[PDB]
């Protein structure tokens, strides 16, 4: 599922126009909010849309999540992924849009 880090969120609204479940909306104060974190499919569309990495994906503790998180920053030609393990160690993985696997 995902969490919105409201202190980082700049209220741009971009994450509210991507979700296949319509789960994200902009509150009156401008911040984004998820309707119900239990309904998230973990498609990461919102994570990649946020320009300030205020959205992070994490695995529900109820199914074994231990606090690792995934954030994503879109560049002109790539997605830079920031993976933070459960002890805070960060790994940065850049995947060029034209890179094929």
């Amino acid at each position: 599922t995902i969490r919105i880090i409201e202190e980082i969120c700049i209220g741009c609204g971009l994450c509210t126009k991507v979700c296949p479940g319509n789960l994200l909306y902009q509150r009156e104060d401008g911040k984004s909010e998820i309707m119900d974190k239990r309904d998230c499919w973990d498609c990461a569309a919102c994570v990649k849309e946020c320009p300030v990495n205020a959205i992070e994906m994490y695995l529900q503790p109820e199914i074994g999540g231990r606090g690792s998180t995934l954030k994503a920053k879109k560049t002109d030609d790539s997605i830079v992924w920031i993976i933070t393990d459960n002890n805070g160690e960060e790994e940065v993985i850049e995947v060029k849009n034209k890179k094929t696997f």
Binding site: A44, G67, K99
Partner: protein, 544 residues
């Protein structure tokens, strides 16, 4: 509430893989056609492709023919398929892959199938091509029923979840491309992770339910596709080496054919017989191989990365555990959905269908869904040539649908929420209609209980109360799935044989039966409020 009447030539319900290609193909055929897509979410990412794709699975290498594809499809499921649908899909698989490249999908070399892709943005590129073609799109708009006039579909009703609007959309022809149905059974992890599943949790059978309510015929709901995927995160396995049980034995070697159904069946046996869990044996791959895997999964199923980080799993040292999903009602990887003719016309005049919502042809994949959208829209374009949207819809019929759509919003007496009824339904189906908890096995006595329990859920729908238009969407997802579930139970009750292992496990009739080499179809009778089963004979494809 503002009621808006819209007019279009071609109305497409659902802007996913099949609906986008249908709309693009329509504009390519006739630039002057008015084409409107009604999409529940946001077309840039909506549907099964939201997370990206691992590969383009279905196209033909040099020397392969549609006949080769038909035989593969029969080997991957059974001999009882709609050969005419499979063959006509096969003729266009390669053309559909070429269009994806034209639209901007990154592709590189290393036969033809040996390509490297980045599927991360497959849906955005498809959506961008759709809008560039001049297609009009109503996003965040939920279709709720077809507009019927004299047994002919001439449009659809829909409501917005971002504005206080109800749409009466008149059209010369309608194409259903809503995908299949998930969320009928309990998922692998109910509650906190209830939408961590293989199929889209936002494809909730709307197309099936609108079809059934309008009188259209469905087929083969007893064939419930179950996905074998990485445990808990439900990530693809194609990316990731052989299958092993917990003893390290390559248990597939015990079976003659290594087909998708066989891999699931074999894995269930290993677990049931005390040799699980089962895994993909990634042990021994290189450090660079691990990095490649991480980059690929980030582009189509990122949750697995978090599982590996949390559980200290390095695939070169620890194999990847796999298991089966809930059963889904789909016509992409399975063969459940609308009954259509070779031109993808449903049993209702004016209504066509394409993609995971159409039954009879399993192993469709993205290219196959795109191809079906083209076939359907080509047929619809020929059908609308003569006519015009001059149909007059009585205000009373409009008011009737409005009352039905918004009923729980005005229900001060309601006592249940959509979420409560959804869970109740999923429990019934899991326990009495062959869910995970029964290892997918069904028997007559439990199915008869499921039939009666679903009717009692249906009775309680009128006791649902919602507070906003988003919760109203959830109500309609539940209304739709209850009807689909009632059809599934009737299909499962009727086929007294086991034709598809795992996907249709009739434990009380465990053998395949030559007397059952026919299609089991259903129709919803709105007068008696009952599902009616129709038998359709199998026909060899012989075009002349």
């Amino acid at each position: 509430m503002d009621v808006k009447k819209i007019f279009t030539d071609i109305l497409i319900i659902g802007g996913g893989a099949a609906g986008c290609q249908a709309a693009i193909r329509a504009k390519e055929i006739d630039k002057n056609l008015d084409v409107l897509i009604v999409e529940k979410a946001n077309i840039i990412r909506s549907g099964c492709l939201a997370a990206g794709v691992n590969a383009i699975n279905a196209y033909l290498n040099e020397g392969e023919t549609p006949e080769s594809y038909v035989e593969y499809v029969k080997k991957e499921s059974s001999g009882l398929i709609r050969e005419d649908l499979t063959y006509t899909i096969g003729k266009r698989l390669n053309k559909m892959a070429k269009k994806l490249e034209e639209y901007g999908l990154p592709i590189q070399k290393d036969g033809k199938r040996s390509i490297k892709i980045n599927g991360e943005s497959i849906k955005p590129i498809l959506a961008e091509a759709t809008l560039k073609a001049g297609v009009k799109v109503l996003n965040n708009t939920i279709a709720t029923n077809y507009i019927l006039k004299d047994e002919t579909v001439c449009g659809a009703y829909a409501f917005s979840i971002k504005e206080n609007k109800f749409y009466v959309i008149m059209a010369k022809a309608v194409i259903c491309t809503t995908g299949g149905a998930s969320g009928i059974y309990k998922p692998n992890n109910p509650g906190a992770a209830r939408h961590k599943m293989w199929y889209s949790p936002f494809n909730t059978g709307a197309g099936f339910a609108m079809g059934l309510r309008a009188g259209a015929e469905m087929t083969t709901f007893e064939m419930r596709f179950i996905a074998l995927r990485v445990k808990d995160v439900i990530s693809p396995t194609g990316t990731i080496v052989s299958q092993i049980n917990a003893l390290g034995e390559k248990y597939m070697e015990k079976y003659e054919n290594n087909t998708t159904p066989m891999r699931l069946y074999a894995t269930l046996i290993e677990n049931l017989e005390g040799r699980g869990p089962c895994y993909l044996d990634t042990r021994g791959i290189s450090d660079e191989d691990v990095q490649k895997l991480k980059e690929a999964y980030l582009s189509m199923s990122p949750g697995i990365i978090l599982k590996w980080k949390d559980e200290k799993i390095n695939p070169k040292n620890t194999p990847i555990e796999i298991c089966g999903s809930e059963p889904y009602i789909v016509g992409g990887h399975g063969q459940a959905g609308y009954w259509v003719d070779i031109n993808r016309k449903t049993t209702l005049e004016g209504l066509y269908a394409a993609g995971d919502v159409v039954g009879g042809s399993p192993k469709k994949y993205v290219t196959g869904c795109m191809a079906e959208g083209e076939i359907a829209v080509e047929a619809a374009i020929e059908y609308i040539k003569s006519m015009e949207n001059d149909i007059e819809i009585d205000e009373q019929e409009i008011a009737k649908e409005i009352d039905r759509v918004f009923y729980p919003l005005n229900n001060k007496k309601g006592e249940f929420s959509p979420d409560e009824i959804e869970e109740r339904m999923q429990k019934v189906m899991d326990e009495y209609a062959g869910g995970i908890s029964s290892y997918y096995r069904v028997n007559e006595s439990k199915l008869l209980i499921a039939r009666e329990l679903l009717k009692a859920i249906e009775e309680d729908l009128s006791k649902i109360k919602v507070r906003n238009r988003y919760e109203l969407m959830k109500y309609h997802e539940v209304v739709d799935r209850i009807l689909v579930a009632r059809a599934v139970v009737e299909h499962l009750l009727y086929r007294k044989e086991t034709r598809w292992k795992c996907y249709q496990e009739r434990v009380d009739y465990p053998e395949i039966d030559d007397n059952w080499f026919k299609f089991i179809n259903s129709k919803y009778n709105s007068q008696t409020n009952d599902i009616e089963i129709i038998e359709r004979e199998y026909e060899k494809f012989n075009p002349v």
